[PDB]
Amino acid sequence: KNPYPVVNLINSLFSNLMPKVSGQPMEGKDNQVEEVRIYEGSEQLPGDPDIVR
Amino acid sequence: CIPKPGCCPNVASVPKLLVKGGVEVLSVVTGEDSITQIELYLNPRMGVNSPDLPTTSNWYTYTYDLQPKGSSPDQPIKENLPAYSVARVSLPMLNEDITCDTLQMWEAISVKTEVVGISSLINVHYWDMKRVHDYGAGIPVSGVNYHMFAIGGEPLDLQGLVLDYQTQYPKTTNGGPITIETVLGRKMTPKNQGLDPQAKAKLDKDGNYPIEVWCPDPSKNENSRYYGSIQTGSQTPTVLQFSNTLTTVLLDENGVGPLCKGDGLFISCADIVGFLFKTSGKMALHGLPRYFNVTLRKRWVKNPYPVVNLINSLFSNLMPKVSGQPMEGKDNQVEEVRIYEGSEQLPGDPDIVRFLDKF
Amino acid sequence: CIPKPGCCPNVASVPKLLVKGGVEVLSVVTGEDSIT
Amino acid sequence: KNPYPVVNLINSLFSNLMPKVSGQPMEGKDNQVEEVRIYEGSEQLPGDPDIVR
Amino acid sequence: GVNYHMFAIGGEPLDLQGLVLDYQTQYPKTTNGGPITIETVLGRKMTPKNQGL
Ligand SMILES: [Ca+2]
């Protein structure tokens, strides 16, 4: 059974083939990213709006 | 409504065109039943291969003065080596059906061709033409002819053969033309005066594969169709005909034309018209371009190659390669290979010999 | 048409051999149950 | 089972029914056969006449 | 005298491990041909760790 599904290889291939992009660091030790939130569905309003999950 | 088919007169039905223009319109997406049609030309690359250079473009579509050296060996000038012409036409992508494992490829079904500029040959008044006799007119362009063209979906495969292997063709420099010892890597042997299966090379570039050295390899030109002609004489007359009614069909005995791999149409041609007898006695060849009216259509084919195995070849860890002992080719270190499938009644001799003359 | 089973003797069922040769042979297309 | 055809055997023994010729080589190291193709049956059209394996 | 016999069958190139009887030895350098030694793989002179695993 193909262990590596083709779709993941396709993107993983052209990305290396496509011209690279040397921007400001956005991943790794010196990432320039502060918060990243992810929502899904609706819940009753929690008290603390600064909640972290 | 108001068509009135009985009252309205009858008008014949013909295929309608959706667009007409340059290459730019080739990017128009079409249906499956669409039929494109390309009209293009190819100027003759015959040693003097560009009018743009200012120094010596006065001899475009010509060669320098040909003459025998007179002392072994021969060191010919690049501008005395007529070469084949070639071009690739990038065709747009097509649909595919992975579930059914089929896809579309461009098929060339018919080609209309013609040699442009034939009428230009009646010019007997050139200020340096050798008179046929005193107080007379010049000697019209005549002599050797080499006509050839090819239509295919992959570059034309070639075979090399020369008239003398002693000949020292120009070196492998990038601007220089490709010769026999270029592809081999060694000075060519007298075997090359005859057929040599080692002297093969595809027609990659333009104006770099000389005619007097290369000829279409009939064995592997199987996904393309080529036609040729020749006449060899000192002052042999040149006979050519042309019209727009002559159409050439490219289909094979199975009913398919050349399939454009990589969505690319490959066209090759070469037409030597004759010599140009100069007053000084010197001689030089001349050529003319060709017209090409290719009719293309869409055909469905089965993808013969497994996708996953094919794409994995690009990954290093999935396709490992080594510099092992010779296990393929002239020095293969394999003695026998047997394939077993299904069962049969027991044969007597286990070492079955199929050829009759062997034992 | 078929030969008389009683009039004709039976033999063993050895695996069928399709081809025997050099390296140029591996190109042969074979079924899903073939052995090399 | 007899693997070898009886008639073809005795045909080898006669110079008339098995003529030989000392011609250019068509076998061995210096053979002069560029390619051989063997067709049997029928399939759907492949997308490449220059099939590689 | 001395005998050493091994064979390996696999769908991948055989994975090897480096171990030398003496790291003091200086094997010939790899110059477009010639043996490949631990020095060639690591890029450093062999440390006495290499006498072990
Ligand atoms: Ca062939």
Residue numbers in the entry:
A (entry chain B), D (entry chain C): 319 to 371
B (entry chain A): 18 to 376
C (entry chain B): 18 to 53
E (entry chain B): 160 to 212
Paper text:
Merkel cell polyomavirus (MCPyV) is a human double-stranded DNA tumor virus. MCPyV cell entry is unique among members of the polyomavirus family as it requires the engagement of two types of glycans, sialylated oligosaccharides and sulfated glycosaminoglycans (GAGs). On the virus side, PyV-receptor interactions are mediated entirely by the major capsid protein VP1, which forms the capsid outer layer. VP1 assembles into 72 pentameric capsomers, giving rise to small capsids of 45 to 50 nm in diameter.
